[PDB]
Design a protein around this ligand. Structure first.
Ligand SMILES: Nc1ncnc2c1ncn2[C@@H]1O[C@H](COP(=O)(O)OP(=O)(O)O)[C@@H](O)[C@H]1O
Ligand SMILES: Nc1ncnc2c1ncn2[C@@H]1O[C@H](COP(=O)(O)OP(=O)(O)O)[C@@H](O)[C@H]1O
Ligand SMILES: [Mg+2]
Ligand SMILES: [Mg+2]
Ligand SMILES: [Mg+2]
Ligand SMILES: [Mg+2]
Lengths: 495, 493, 494, 492
């Protein structure tokens, strides 16, 4: 009979569960959104209990939807929004605070303190990361320093830290497995990517007790079975979502690159077994560990990509569904002079301005909602443009193509705009959910669903190519006004 | 704190509710699923989406609460018919919903051949497309190979309770309760067993039918899932019978009306099956501690679903709750009547060919009047089955207990009270369908020690008393009945 | 450039259109006014807002044209028919709202007159049927129900008028109190055989003769405007549907047009002969020009484009009238839904004063798309029934139909109509043939144009719709339409 | 009873209002007309639609009234119309006051040292706001225009002159002192067209109208189909008309109008006062042979930003919904909206600033956007009041307000909170039209004195401030931060 691989993809915006077959084809998908909590502008939080309820309910749903039961599932693969920090009671499994999301800006001033104290080069060398509110360590420190009774419980060994993967695996195993993988660990700013170990010097700097940390495991390995209560399904793959997308795009050789258009926008290049330090404001990170071999990546991180479309839908309410942004944008011929820097949670690479905020500029009396949707799409593509120009310099290579994926990559208009900005081709494959696909791959190799990586190479199938159709001079004048708008967005928040 | 899980698989959404021992709702999850209309008059559900929607809200509500579930009670949209391969659990056709009208002409054939009274005497039911038997026969007649498979015992028939329990136990339990079984038109409510005369009439092989059980007893436990532990399954009842039990209507003469997808008025008649003389149904309420209780029922096909049509179809409201605000933009119905026969007419009309009819429209008619007429149309339909039941019982009621999602509309309840000429009692918990399933399961595992323990949990939240002149009410009822006749005998095929 | 000014006082909006010598619309202004419903079934207009809306669009279109009133060669007047205005001869103040042709309040009295044997009499004298549609019972209602009206009327202190007469009264500050033969024929007080007010009918409705305007030809220089002001010659008057017949060049016996406006109105030119209908149509006066009277056969549908305005204003499922076509195209067919738009009862061939708007066939899958599509079909089905009645009367099978009016702009409605008939629909370049015809009447009177022959070449086909064959579907739709119509009938009782 | 007809030709719509002797509105009609944007930054009106919309509303109110003792004319200022003298056909669209196309040429004149001369002669600053560069653009860019202008075959007019031209079928070619002062071709010290400025802008004197008093029987309208000949007896630029309508006829008296833009005017008596804080010196009116002057702060986009929410962004469907939508949130949520949709007027005078929304986060709603629009209106008025207080060396304790957008109670409370003093809103918000009526009525003796009409000014509501001055100072600080982020945006 038929066997399937289950990928759980716990995203910033929704949790997904997808069933793949041996051909890498999606057979069934369930998806469920969960609340984006903003206690004050600049802060972003998730209910850790709704992360779990949304993720496990769509897991039950997709199996049921498939007409099958857990008996037909070969293995579970876990991938997740990265950096986001959960802290719970080791004995009751209750979160002691909400999850603080990677987008949250509240630790910006402390990160600036750490820069002024001289820690930038030490942090970069050990972790590949920059001193930004983006990563987990300062969020963990915030919870231990601010939640009533948290510091004393952590020093007694009664607390657990996790990125979302660890939280989900904890809940899936009734607390019997407290683990993370190297790729998720590398995003915490507590994990030395050169020694591939939690860094006691960094733990000392952040005043974090080592006992609160999970065990770091490789990205593809039978770690154990589920036991929420219950069905015994092997959990065999873990990876941060953007690394899993890289794995899902077959970018397993040095120099291969993809960009994901999801809640944010993330460009990752595989750098083999060498940690490459950026000269152009990008991150050094761990790609995965498989068969005992570590692979590294360079990364450009854009905080708000598709989330700017979600803002048009839920905040501004000028569209009813995400898919209408392209239709609305096409009611106008161009951006009409409007530029939208979507720094709704600050600016990531290459700017790293924790204090920039969302900025729409150039509005006149004839500006319409169509111009706003079109400038939203351009602002997404402008941000990816900037991290690609950073990565090309780090690589000292001019690109001729770019593989793309993620939910916002479904917009043909967005991909054409992006192609036009780049002056080279955009390549969109048949399966846009490469994040979940990569996790399925990682788990499937570990249990033997697939015999080797060569077996799954022929599954990467191009669906549509976009080629540039615009004058390089006019593109450079749009780019010029984009960079001018970005500066207008910066150094806005003072507190 | 131990809890009891109620699964309420409705016509338009699946729910999972956790109750504590005080009868309070502690956690609730709900998820809609697709209403499939292959041609006007047909109504289908995907059985795998009935299942996926029901199991995902069960997983979600358990997860929300953070092993501590004492038992599960199962309750469901009745009559809706599911047929599946016994070895694969693959449905061989969509579920054919109770509202579906495709078997109307075959029912009329059986009427003309003289099977109407035999069916009434055996099953308590009116020969109508409403019930399961003709839907199962359609599937066996029209699905390639299904007939030979059913004859060999390789297929299963179930109402939705049976389908849910099949999937919950990975095909280890193939059961229904007496209340659901009584809605199939294959179950004799006097012998309390499947009827061989009716099975031969509809050409249904007995091998395809589940075992009929009590409404409250530990049947077994759920099969191993990802989201929970093995949980006892300990209650089953058709949703409207569960609502009657949830309303504490355990004594002869007690009545409730549910305002849900449709509208359903049931009176408990004790150990006595009471045959209607006024176009109502005689049905099984439940079986508990070995004792069978019966009911008289008035069945309205489209009640809250007409509000859903204003939202999804006409799109003059964005959410169900907005129907009352919109109706309150006008002072009265403006001359407009809406017979919501969107799936034909149920009791007391039993017109399979009636269709939705809006009449009396003028140039000043607004969307406010349409909303008002929608609510009045729900209330007028309930009016007609109450008058029928008052005739059967030879009583003039002085009050009526109500529940259900659409009973949240204070305006709809005021309209209803004005039409009735007596009081309407709305309790604190409107989800009496799920509550009743919880009660049946909880009594069975001892979560509650006796029905005397749960009495105190019925709490009155608001009473509505009539306001309008009787002669004005009489005029409106007269035009309503005039509109009903304009709706009738519309479809010919 | 010399221009001709047409004033088209419609049921829904007042319009002013300036035409050149080529018959081309050069400028147009339009303004809606309030539709007043004191109780369901009643329909009233504020006569002062008819005036203020009409005089303000006249001013606006002249200013819009970069010209002044001096450049205007003449004014032609056309109007919603039957609608009844009564005002004080001395103060020009109306004594009551205008009672609109759609109004049903006089239905029971019409039935009274029927049961007293007056049906054959009314038809012989006027060509009309006993129905709340026509002016006489509305005027009688006002004299009988307005405090002091009956005394003022017998004293000669009141004026009656259809809307042409009201506008001309205001335009001349009471110096001209006139109507034309076509408007007059709609009052049920004007004998179309003698071509004069009928004293027997006046006795029956208890209407004093002194309250009636003088009936004039449809094309002749009556006098000048004089609101205070500038003298422009008023030189043409016609009821709007007869103006549309004249605007469609339907000046020879047997020529036909249907207008898709607030209602739907099918008129055939019958020349010098008043043909009496055997299929529930009206016999009416088309016009009188150069001393020559032309008659027509008419089929009258009360609610056509008004059903679209009801989707916009009442149901609010469209924002603009033109969106009805787009919404209707979101579905492939009516989905089983039928909409009998009897919002003001049923006109020809049913003449049911008590029928009311009816939507039937709704199921759980029915959408606003189907409602839009059923609305367009209901317009087309009602035109289908009067065309079939006119073919029987004429003993002729049509092979084409010239169409016009605001709702004829809908390509989907015209295709549906062509599909139902199985023959082509011809839409001309100017949809405002009501206004065009009124302009023709005034232009011929002042010599702006020399003759009918001269204007013939101005009628230019914009688009032809040819029928798409779907015989089984169409027969089934028409059958359920007739079934639906019966479900709408005999609804109101009081 | 006789009535006065005020014709208020606004930037957004044309209105006609009939007032009785008590100053109450007896009839009012309003009709919008098209805002044409050939390219972002440009703003044009169809002069034929200005005319038709104004006639339509006039004919409608005259129809309802049916006794018009006189007509007062008031209008959007600066907006420039050029037409053929013999055919009355305009040779180009009207170039509206908001239009920015002449910005680079104004900067060219600044570089060539003409700022002080322009300010001393006209009270104005070199900005695309004013008529002169718009007239020059039309004469330069429309084929054959310059030949016709030198031969005296063309007419120039602000909107008052265009309306009177059409109302009299070309028999009267006039403007008043207040409208003329806004052209940058009229010397407000000599009170006459300035030959030196005309030479500078290459404008022939033969295309200008005759400048008249603001209250005087100039003549009568021509006979129309809808009315007899009516005396035309008052003309003033709309914002000066509002100053008159607010009874601000004594030195030091101030009002602010919240209309399409926002305009703060103080009467300075018979003395032209030159600003030291980026305001304009302008002619208030001339009545009974006496010229009155004013200081003015000009905000280009006030209520027009609400119209942009309605027509552009479409998050409201009627202008009045802005307050309700803004009340769905408790504060601006960190969002600031600089409504520089046509550049920035006083005190910034940045022709190249454009509309800027800043501070957006993921939880920002359309509610916050509505609230930031109202605050942005109030912030701009805050800035011109602060500049005016510096010129006048006086701390205000109150401010009289009027205009279509002042009907928003929320907007007025925000403004009061920011100011820290009270806002006085009178019963009739149409003080522009009221002032036109007053000017016309005085001229024909409908009212026999200024003192007679004084009692017609009735306070309808007073708003008192209710917020902490430091929390306001921080909002104001961020507002000023946002303004700078909007500036020097356009390069061409
Ligand atoms: N694009 C359109 N499509 C369909 N109907 C339309 C359209 N535009 C206007 N209408 C309809 O036109 C009707 C008015 O047509 P018109 O000829 O002006 O009326 P009247 O017969 O009163 O003179 C209205 O009832 C309106 O619903
Ligand atoms: N209720 C309201 N609340 C807020 N703004 C309003 C309201 N009604 C109209 N407006 C605004 O009023 C402005 C027009 O005011 P008005 O005095 O008529 O204009 P103008 O100053 O151009 O003559 C428009 O920009 C519109 O957005
Ligand atoms: Mg997500
Ligand atoms: Mg339901
Ligand atoms: Mg009309
Ligand atoms: Mg305006």
């Amino acid at each position: 009979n038929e066997k399937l691989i289950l990928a759980l993809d716990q995203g910033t915006t929704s949790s997904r569960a997808i069933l793949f077959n041996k051909s890498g084809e999606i057979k069934f998908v369930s998806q469920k959104s969960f609340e984006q909590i903003f206690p004050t502008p600049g802060w972003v939080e998730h209910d850790p209990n709704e992360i779990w309820s949304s993720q496990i309910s769509v897991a039950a749903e997709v199996i049921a939807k498939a007409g099958i039961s857990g008996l037909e599932v070969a293995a579970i693969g876990i991938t997740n929004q990265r950096e986001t920090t959960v802290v719970w009671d080791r004995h009751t499994s209750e979160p002691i605070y909400n999850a603080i999301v990677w987008q949250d800006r509240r630790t910006s001033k402390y990160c600036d303190e750490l820069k002024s104290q001289g820690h930038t080069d030490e942090i970069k060398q050990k972790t590949g990361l920059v001193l930004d509110a983006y990563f987990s360590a300062t969020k963990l420190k915030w919870i231990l320093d601010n939640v009533e009774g948290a510091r004393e419980k952590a020093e007694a060994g009664d607390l657990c830290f996790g990125t979302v993967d660890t939280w989900l695996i904890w809940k899936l195993t009734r607390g019997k497995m407290f683990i993370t993988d190297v790729s998720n660990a590398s995003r915490t700013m507590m994990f030395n990517i050169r020694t591939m170990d939690w860094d006691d010097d960094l733990l000392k700097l952040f005043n974090i007790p080592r006992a609160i940390l999970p065990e770091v495991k490789q990205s593809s390995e039978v770690y154990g079975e589920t036991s929420t209560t219950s069905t015994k399904i092997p959990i065999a793959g873990i990876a941060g979502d953007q690394q899993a997308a890289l794995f899902g795009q077959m970018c397993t050789k040095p120099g291969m690159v993809k960009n994901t258009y999801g809640t944010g926008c993330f460009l990752l290049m595989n750098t083999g077994n060498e940690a490459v330090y950026s000269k152009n404001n990008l991150l050094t990170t761990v790609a995965w560990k498989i068969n005992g071999e570590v692979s590294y990546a360079l990364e450009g991180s854009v905080f708000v990509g598709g989330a700017a479309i979600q803002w048009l839908r839920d905040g501004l309410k000028i569209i009813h569904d995400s898919s209408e942004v392209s239709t609305l944008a096409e009611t106008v011929e161009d951006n009409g002079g409007v530029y939208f820097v979507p720094a709704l949670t600050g600016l990531g690479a290459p700017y790293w301005d924790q204090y920039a905020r969302g900025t729409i500029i150039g509005v006149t009396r004839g500006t319409t909602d169509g111009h706003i949707a079109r400038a939203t799409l351009e602002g997404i593509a402008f941000q990816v443009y900037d991290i690609v120009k950073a990565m090309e310099a780090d690589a000292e290579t001019q690109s001729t193509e770019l593989r793309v994926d993620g939910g916002a990559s479904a917009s043909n208009l967005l991909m054409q705009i992006q192609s036009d900005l780049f002056g080279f081709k955009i390549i969109r494959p048949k399966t846009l959910e490469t994040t979940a696909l990569g996790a399925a791959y990682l788990a499937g190799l570990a249990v033997g669903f697939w015999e080797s990586i060569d077996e799954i190479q022929s599954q990467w199938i191009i669906e549509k190519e976009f080629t540039p159709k615009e004058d390089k001079t006019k593109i450079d004048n749009m780019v010029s006004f984009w960079h001018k708008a970005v500066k207008r967005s910066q150094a806005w928040i003072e507190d």
